[PDB]
Symmetry: C2
Subunit: 99 residues, 2 copies
């Protein structure tokens, strides 16, 4: 699709069998999702946002559907205002910015 | 242009007579620029994301050139670690997400 930006670019994602809402976020390198159970091990990651740096859980090679497109990659889990899909997964679904 | 998301979507902007580098950010409601002086009245605002909140000054009816395109709108100014062009100005230059 072509998504205009008059409203928040919210899409439906599917991860761990659960449907959630997430924001398509070109301003984030990484993908951050609110607390949930994911399979396998995690490793520590520090990420920086507008308020500063926080610690999150990094799960690699997670299967996640994003607006109907399958991606498999790194998902960070931690305290976020909204689930955010970052460039690591936007590139997998073939997303570009155009004007 | 069509901007790939392999790297950060950074562009050159001109605001208040100054050239700056800024992130094209679909995940941001508003535009927020590292602290600088702007003309006219302002009011305080709190904005929050990863790492919590920061206090900023809200200036309305500010003209910015974004990669050569003039747009006008609200600009927030404060201690952001990165210059952010948010949806309120991305819409004005006709920016869309496509996949
Ligand atoms: C958290 C989202 C929902 C909203 N933000 C935009 C996001 O793109 C934000 C932009 C940014 C990048 C680097 C440093 C600081 C900020 N990226 C971000 O945090 O990257 C983290 C998460 C994964 O990778 C690292 S915001 O800055 O908090 C914000 C809030 C309100 C307004 N009016 C404007 C901006």
């Amino acid at each position: 699709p072509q998504i205009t930006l008059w409203k928040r670019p919210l899409v439906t994602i599917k991860i761990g069998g659960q449907l959630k809402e997430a924001l398509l976020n070109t301003g984030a390198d990484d993908t951050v999702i609110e607390d949930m159970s994911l399979p396998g091990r995690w490793k520590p990651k520090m990420i920086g946002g507008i308020g500063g740096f926080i610690k999150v859980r990094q799960y690699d090679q997670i299967i996640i559907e994003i607006a109907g497109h399958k991606a498999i990659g790194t998902v960070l889990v931690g305290p976020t205002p909204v689930n955010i899909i970052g460039r690591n997964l936007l590139t997998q679904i073939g997303a570009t910015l155009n004007f």
